[PDB]
Amino acid sequence: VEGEVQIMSTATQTFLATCINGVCWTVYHGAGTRTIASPKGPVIQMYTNVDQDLVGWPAPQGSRSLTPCTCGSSDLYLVTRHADVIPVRRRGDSRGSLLSPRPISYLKGSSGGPLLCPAGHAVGLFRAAVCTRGVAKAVDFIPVENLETTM
Amino acid sequence: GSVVIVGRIVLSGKPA
Ligand SMILES: [Zn+2]
């Protein structure tokens, strides 16, 4: 059994990564230029794109790749590090609003997780929570085309 | 330091 999404840890921080097209992606503001652990020792990033807050490693063992959305919908679903699935309406290239706003702590440690279309394909990686007095009402995300172009 | 993997999520819910 393989997973598309890996729960990840650094000393100071905790976040998610999403495998797509054979690459394991997450947010720069989590991993920096750090390497990924493997049973043969550290593996270096293949991609680092600070402009876009995006880094990629080679897909780890025990992982499955997500297919990118060709599907177009604006109905997205954000998956958290607890495997909650949060409905999000897409507004712009890289913006979407929660259908039911949540305390920001509910999104904590979930950046790098996937926004999925209705077919369960990849629309983008969850980048950042837009908060108002502690309530997350929308999210920034890295569109999946940014990944494709980076490649 | 290196980034380590501490768990995994399977989207379909597929059991081992
Ligand atoms: Zn789609």
From TrEMBL, chain A:
<comment type="subunit">
    <text>Forms a heterodimer with envelope glycoprotein E1. Interacts with host CD81 and SCARB1 receptors; these interactions play a role in viral entry into host cell. Interacts with host EIF2AK2/PKR; this interaction inhibits EIF2AK2 and probably allows the virus to evade the innate immune response. Interacts with host CD209/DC-SIGN and CLEC4M/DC-SIGNR. Interact with host SPCS1; this interaction is essential for viral particle assembly. Interacts with protease NS2. The heterodimer E1/E2 interacts with host CLDN1; this interaction plays a role in viral entry into host cell.</text>
</comment>
<comment type="subunit">
    <text>Homodimer. Interacts with host SPCS1; this interaction is essential for viral particle assembly. Interacts with envelope glycoprotein E1. Interacts with envelope glycoprotein E2. Interacts with viroporin p7. Interacts with serine protease/helicase NS3. Part of the replication complex composed of NS2, NS3, NS4A, NS4B, NS5A and the RNA-directed RNA polymerase embedded in an ER-derived membranous web. Part of the viral assembly initiation complex composed of NS2, E1, E2, NS3, NS4A, NS5A and the mature core protein.</text>
</comment>
<protein>
    <recommendedName>
        <fullName>Genome polyprotein</fullName>
    </recommendedName>
</protein>
<feature type="domain" description="Peptidase S29">
    <location>
        <begin position="1"/>
        <end position="151"/>
    </location>
</feature>
